[PDB]
Design a protein around this motif. Structure first.
Motif, PDB file in Angstrom:
ATOM      1  N   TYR A 544       0.819  -1.206   0.000  1.00  0.00           N
ATOM      2  CA  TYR A 544       0.000   0.000   0.000  1.00  0.00           C
ATOM      3  C   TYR A 544       0.857   1.261   0.000  1.00  0.00           C
ATOM      4  O   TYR A 544       0.510   2.251  -0.656  1.00  0.00           O
ATOM      5  CB  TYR A 544      -0.947  -0.011   1.198  1.00  0.00           C
ATOM      6  CG  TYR A 544      -1.832   1.204   1.251  1.00  0.00           C
ATOM      7  CD1 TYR A 544      -2.889   1.354   0.365  1.00  0.00           C
ATOM      8  CD2 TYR A 544      -1.602   2.211   2.174  1.00  0.00           C
ATOM      9  CE1 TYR A 544      -3.696   2.472   0.405  1.00  0.00           C
ATOM     10  CE2 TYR A 544      -2.403   3.326   2.221  1.00  0.00           C
ATOM     11  CZ  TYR A 544      -3.444   3.454   1.333  1.00  0.00           C
ATOM     12  OH  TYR A 544      -4.231   4.578   1.380  1.00  0.00           O
ATOM     13  N   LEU A 545       1.973   1.248   0.734  1.00  0.00           N
ATOM     14  CA  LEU A 545       2.834   2.427   0.810  1.00  0.00           C
ATOM     15  C   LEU A 545       3.506   2.715  -0.527  1.00  0.00           C
ATOM     16  O   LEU A 545       3.653   3.883  -0.915  1.00  0.00           O
ATOM     17  CB  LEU A 545       3.881   2.237   1.905  1.00  0.00           C
ATOM     18  CG  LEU A 545       4.608   3.500   2.370  1.00  0.00           C
ATOM     19  CD1 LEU A 545       3.612   4.594   2.715  1.00  0.00           C
ATOM     20  CD2 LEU A 545       5.511   3.197   3.554  1.00  0.00           C
ATOM     21  N   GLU A 548       0.897   4.314  -2.669  1.00  0.00           N
ATOM     22  CA  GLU A 548       0.674   5.687  -2.224  1.00  0.00           C
ATOM     23  C   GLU A 548       1.754   6.620  -2.749  1.00  0.00           C
ATOM     24  O   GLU A 548       1.452   7.678  -3.320  1.00  0.00           O
ATOM     25  CB  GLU A 548       0.633   5.744  -0.699  1.00  0.00           C
ATOM     26  CG  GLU A 548      -0.673   5.309  -0.087  1.00  0.00           C
ATOM     27  CD  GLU A 548      -1.595   6.477   0.196  1.00  0.00           C
ATOM     28  OE1 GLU A 548      -1.537   7.477  -0.549  1.00  0.00           O
ATOM     29  OE2 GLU A 548      -2.379   6.397   1.164  1.00  0.00           O
ATOM     30  N   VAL A 551       1.635   6.866  -6.740  1.00  0.00           N
ATOM     31  CA  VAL A 551       0.476   7.587  -7.255  1.00  0.00           C
ATOM     32  C   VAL A 551       0.570   9.067  -6.903  1.00  0.00           C
ATOM     33  O   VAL A 551       0.244   9.933  -7.726  1.00  0.00           O
ATOM     34  CB  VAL A 551      -0.825   6.942  -6.738  1.00  0.00           C
ATOM     35  CG1 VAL A 551      -2.024   7.850  -6.961  1.00  0.00           C
ATOM     36  CG2 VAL A 551      -1.051   5.613  -7.434  1.00  0.00           C
ATOM     37  N   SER A 552       1.053   9.385  -5.694  1.00  0.00           N
ATOM     38  CA  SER A 552       1.203  10.784  -5.306  1.00  0.00           C
ATOM     39  C   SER A 552       2.198  11.508  -6.205  1.00  0.00           C
ATOM     40  O   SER A 552       1.930  12.622  -6.671  1.00  0.00           O
ATOM     41  CB  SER A 552       1.639  10.879  -3.846  1.00  0.00           C
ATOM     42  OG  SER A 552       1.774  12.231  -3.445  1.00  0.00           O
TER      43      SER A 552
END
Ligand code: SF4
Ligand SMILES: [Zn+2]
Ligand SMILES: [Zn+2]
Lengths: 752, 131, 103, 98
Positions: A544-545, A548, A551-552
């Motif tokens: 997940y990290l 994140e 995508v950021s």
């Protein structure tokens, strides 16, 4: 159709059958005649669930033994899908036979998914729903209302209405999916959870999750009602070992220890108040513990213990209470000094990895706490909470974790390891200690399943390699085989992308997530695939990290702005409710032709159970191999355990777990042989792992696709999508990829 | 205070020499500097106000548990379990009588902890340790 | 230029085919080049309205098999999935255009 | 609203920024017509609630949202919810009488 396998008439609910389905039924029937465990890799896309259900119901009704059927899956959504397939199968059987036979099929889940009370419905946690339903339906509330009709306590009308009618009269005969069961119990004002829990012994087939068979906190009541000579099916069991690790593990934080101290102080205040008011309610419990009565003797069948039993029922001691914890105040002081010893042990500046025996010796030499009173900690705490008749249990929730830790670490000393880390997360400035008691031997939780039931059918869509699991979990397979689907045309086109468009090697390692060039290649790849994908597209990430961060910073440079021009972006939020909204929005966006991209973790919630068939799939973009975090102490301890005991190499097991997660996410895209979707793997390390793929996936992966670039992959994807956009020839698939009844009869005559 | 030692009135921040020098007789937050000042000359009473029990410097130790009540309960358990050490093999496998003995020793530990029957249980302990 | 709207074209054709008499068959030929469409409303309601008005839609796609076009063709053509056609090369586009002149 | 991360070094505009908190309220109100019960086929909420008393090992920080040095969230999860909310709003805008 209707066809015969040996002497067994099989009612298949479709006018056509895949050859792989027939071979699957032949192997299952051979296993059931033998009566042993087996592992069968039924390929995804083909009717894995419907063939299992049809053959097992045919075996159950025809044979005079009439063995019951247990169907254990990994997610509640897959349980509902199996219930829907079973409903279709028994509707077909009722249509063909002309009558509805004596049949019972129910799905079992928690109270949160099966509560119809309007008050306790919006609670976001399952524990508070359970405690409120217990508070209304412990029987103490009912007798209190009977003695005092003017009391402020209330009873659930969905549970009281079950008292008026019999157990067999709860539902009509047939299969009840969760939607239909909820609708029926809303119409009749009944509790579906207590309906399902009381019909476990009556159901011919019962479907639930692996937690209801492996985790002893909830599998204690379920396993008693089922028959020991029943058929057992494991669907999507390729990650079942994690459930075993999830069955016998516990993490304790310093906030949990502070809440445990507060709960122990509240328990001391409550026992002081009850001692002043009425000691008879304590004296009867004390003399019952003197006589040797356990928790089952003191508790009634309708009520449940406050602390669920965290150990196997075979490992529970049959002897009486040792007497150090028999008196209530003595047990309170015992629990308090155990909590203080845990708080002392958490004040450490480095990682301590210790066996449970060493922890027990240190606890005995520092606190004078023995193993035998610890083995009765959860039972004594539940009995004390019952006898105290506390209206509030929220202050004592932290004591449940302490009782679980005390009962787990005392009974188990082999195959378990206690890890104390001074830093839960290394990014935080202030130290946050955490104590992890983890289950290294995954075969411990699944051992009573294989001991109790003779015939276990392990089956996943992408379970590979088939010999790893009988070494990982101690069970012997009578026959293990993996089917390869017979395809008129290459139904799915896998490829391995080792380098980008500019021939720069791409990898999803955690330390190089902030590299420009690999992220440039991933962003350009995602934009090009969104430009060439017609209906929908799903992207999977190792963690997940990582998703994140990528995508950021994709939004920082504006890669996502070009994606918004073609498809809507929906991302797997950590909240399961918002993730469900994102998933249904993705399904709606694929249907109306808007087009959508769904970003998710390859080891997340969307990865398990959720299928992406036809327009919901069409492209599975794999950003790297989903490897676990190697630097975690639990993973390294488990790897050392498997290397020491089962001689499994650490790199081999890491690659096995990562490729089985990748295999399940690749297998989520197919349903039916008419379905198609590309399987793109964007990492340089996938190329050496072609042999670790499932056999049916490995046949579709050509040798020329092992080191493709970005542009070659885009061209191949465009050619593939143009190729199956044509209608296929029925004469090319009339009897090689799908069989009619006459083709099945001809093949049966050719086999003899 | 958990941070400051009221006998010398020193915060842990600017005076890091403060330590958890507890007393088995009466558990208090006295630091090592206050111990080495008052009780190096000889035995004295408790420097905390509201308490005046006579204590020795050589009996000082450090607390291993955060809670004072748990620490004194464990120390009383040590002071009773030294002579009360009957095991299962001491009872020749008699499980019920072993439970009764454990209940009795836990009860006298509780009575020594709360002081409800300190004199009679202390006499019982003194008669038992002679045997 | 722009992002195509299947629903706007279907609504415009529905308005055009409304004064068509009952004996005259109502057919729509959509040469769809893109892979995704942006609609101002629910396209399924438009599909149901076209089915209720006996309008038969045949879609020739250029890149790949779009699911909404397949659903529209299947609904308008009474379950026939053969009315969604995708080319392969230059001459296949010629043959698909020459196939639609037949009633 | 563009999905960019918000940093305190930017001056913004004092007239427009007065609406920011109200915009957050609008985002809350967005969930007020976005949250609805779904089918059990895609009920991801019930999958984690199938076992209510599960107390296994806590997932590592790779499986969790990123945190700052003080432990607070870095705000990168808010832009994910922002674009999911934008997609949900654009899909829900199709559900009308048109
Ligand atoms: S008895 Fe059933 S409906 Fe009533 S609170 Fe419990 S779970 Fe909910
Ligand atoms: Zn001092
Ligand atoms: Zn004192």
């Amino acid at each position: 159709m209707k066809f015969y396998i040996d002497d067994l008439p099989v009612l298949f609910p479709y006018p056509k059958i895949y050859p792989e389905q027939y071979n699957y039924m032949c192997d299952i029937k051979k296993t059931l005649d033998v009566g042993g465990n087996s592992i069968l890799e039924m390929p995804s896309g083909t009717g894995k669930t419907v063939s299992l259900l049809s053959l097992t119901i045919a075996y159950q009704m025809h044979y005079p033994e009439h063995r019951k059927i247990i169907y254990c899956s990994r997610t509640m959504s897959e349980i509902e899908k199996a219930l829907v397939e079973l409903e279709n199968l028994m509707d077909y059987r009722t249509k063909e036979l002309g009558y509805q036979e004596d049949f019972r099929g129910l799905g079992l889940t928690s109270r949160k998914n099966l509560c119809l009370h309007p008050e306790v419905s919006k609670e976001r946690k399952g524990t508070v729903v359970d405690e409120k339903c217990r508070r209304m339906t412990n029987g103490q509330a009912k007798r209190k209302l009977e003695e005092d009709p003017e009391a402020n306590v209330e009873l659930c009308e969905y549970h009281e209405n079950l008292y008026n009618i019999e157990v067999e009269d709860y539902l009509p005969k047939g299969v009840f999916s969760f939607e239909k069961l909820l609708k029926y119990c809303e119409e009749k004002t009944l509790c579906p959870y207590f309906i399902v829990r009381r019909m476990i012994s009556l159901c011919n087939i019962i479907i639930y999750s692996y937690h209801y068979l492996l985790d002893p906190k909830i599998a204690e009541r379920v396993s008693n009602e089922v028959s020991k000579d029943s058929i057992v099916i494991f669907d999507e069991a390729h990650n079942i070992d994690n459930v075993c690790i999830e069955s016998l593990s516990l993490d304790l934080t310093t906030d949990a220890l502070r809440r445990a101290t507060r709960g122990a102080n509240a328990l001391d205040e409550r026992i002081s108040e009850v001692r002043k008011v009425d000691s008879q309610k304590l004296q009867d419990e004390y003399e019952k513990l003197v006589q040797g009565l356990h928790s089952a003797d003191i508790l009634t069948d309708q009520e449940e213990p406050f602390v669920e039993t965290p150990v196997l029922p075979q490992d529970l001691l049959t002897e009486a209470i040792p007497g150090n914890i028999r008196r209530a105040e003595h047990f309170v002081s015992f629990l308090k000094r155990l909590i203080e010893y845990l708080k002392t042990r958490m004040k450490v500046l480095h990682v301590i990895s210790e066996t449970p025996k060493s922890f027990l010796q240190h606890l005995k030499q520092l606190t004078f706490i023995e193993r035998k009173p610890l083995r009765f900690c959860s039972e004594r705490l539940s009995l004390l909470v019952r006898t105290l008749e506390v209206t509030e249990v929220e202050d004592f929730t932290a004591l449940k974790d302490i009782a679980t830790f005390a009962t787990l670490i005392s009974t188990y000393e082999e195959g378990f390891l206690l890890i104390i880390e001074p830093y839960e997360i290394e990014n935080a400035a202030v130290p946050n200690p955490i104590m992890r008691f983890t289950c290294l031997d995954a075969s411990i939780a699944i051992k009573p399943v294989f001991e109790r039931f003779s015939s276990v059918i392990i089956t996943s869509g992408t379970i590979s390699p088939l010999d790893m699991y009988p070494r990982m979990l101690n069970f012997k397979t009578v026959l293990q085989k993996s089917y390869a689907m017979t395809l008129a045309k290459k139904s799915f086109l896998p490829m391995i992308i080792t380098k980008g468009s500019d021939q720069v090697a791409i990898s999803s390692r955690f330390e190089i997530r902030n590299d420009p060039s690999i992220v440039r290649n991933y962003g350009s790849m995602l934009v090009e695939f969104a430009k060439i994908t017609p209906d929908g597209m799903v992207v999977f990430f190792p963690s997940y990290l990582y998703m994140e961060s990528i995508v950021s910073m994709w939004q920082t440079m504006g890669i996502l702005d070009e994606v918004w021009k073609h498809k809507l972006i929906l991302v797997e939020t950590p909240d399961a409710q918002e993730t469900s909204l994102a998933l249904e929005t993705y399904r709606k966006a694929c249907s109306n032709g808007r087009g959508a991209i769904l970003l998710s973790v390859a080891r997340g919630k969307v990865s398990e159970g959720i299928d992406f068939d036809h327009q919901y799939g069409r492209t599975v973009l794999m950003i790297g191999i989903p490897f676990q975090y190697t630097e975690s102490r639990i993973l390294k301890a488990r790897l050392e355990f498997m290397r020491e005991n089962y001689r499994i190499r650490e790199n081999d097991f890491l690659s096995f777990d990562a490729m089985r997660h990748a295999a399940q996410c690749l297998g989520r895209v197919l349903r039916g042989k008419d379905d198609y979707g590309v399987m793109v793997l964007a990492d340089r390390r996938f190329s050496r792992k072609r042999s670790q793929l499932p056999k049916w996936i490995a046949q579709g992966l050509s040798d020329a696709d092992l080191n493709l670039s970005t542009d070659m992959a885009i061209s191949n994807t465009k050619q593939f999508l143009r190729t199956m956009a044509q209608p296929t020839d029925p004469k090319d698939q009339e009897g090689v990829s799908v069989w009619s009844y006459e083709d099945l009869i001809k093949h049966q005559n050719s086999r003899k | 205070n958990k941070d400051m030692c009221p006998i010398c009135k020193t915060d842990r921040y600017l005076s890091p020499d403060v330590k958890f020098l507890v007393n088995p007789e009466c558990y208090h937050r006295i630091c090592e500097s206050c111990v080495d000042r008052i009780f190096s000359l000889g035995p004295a009473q408790c420097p905390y106000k509201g308490c005046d029990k006579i204590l020795r410097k050589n009996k000082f130790k450090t607390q291993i548990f955060d809670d004072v009540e748990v620490e004194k309960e464990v120390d009383i358990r040590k002071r009773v379990f030294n002579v009360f050490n009957k095991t299962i093999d001491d009872f020749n496998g008699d499980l019920v009588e072993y439970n009764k003995y454990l209940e009795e020793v836990e009860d006298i530990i509780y009575k020594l902890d709360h002081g409800i029957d300190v004199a009679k249980t202390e006499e019982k302990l003194r008669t038992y340790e002679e045997l | 230029k722009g992002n195509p709207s299947l629903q706007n074209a279907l609504e415009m054709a529905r308005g055009l085919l409304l004064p068509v008499p009952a004996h005259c068959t109502r057919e729509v030929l959509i040469v769809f080049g893109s892979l995704s469409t942006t609609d101002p409303g629910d396209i399924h309601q438009t599909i149901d309205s076209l089915v209720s008005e006996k309008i038969r839609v045949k879609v020739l796609g250029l890149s790949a098999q779009v699911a909404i076009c397949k659903e529209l063709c299947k609904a308008t053509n009474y379950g026939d999935e053969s009315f969604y056609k995708i080319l392969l090369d230059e001459t296949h586009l010629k043959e698909l255009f020459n196939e639609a002149v037949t009633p | 609203l563009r999905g960019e991360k918000i940093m305190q070094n930017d001056r913004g505009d004092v007239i427009i920024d007065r609406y920011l908190t109200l915009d957050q309220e609008f985002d809350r109100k967005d969930d007020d017509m976005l949250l609805h019960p779904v089918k059990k086929i895609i009920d991801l909420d019930g999958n984690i609630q199938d076992d209510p008393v599960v107390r296994g090992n806590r997932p590592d920080f790779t499986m969790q949202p990123g945190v700052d040095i003080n432990g607070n969230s870095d705000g990168t999860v808010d832009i994910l919810k922002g674009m999911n909310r934008l997609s949900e709003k654009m899909i829900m805008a199709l559900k009308n009488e048109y």
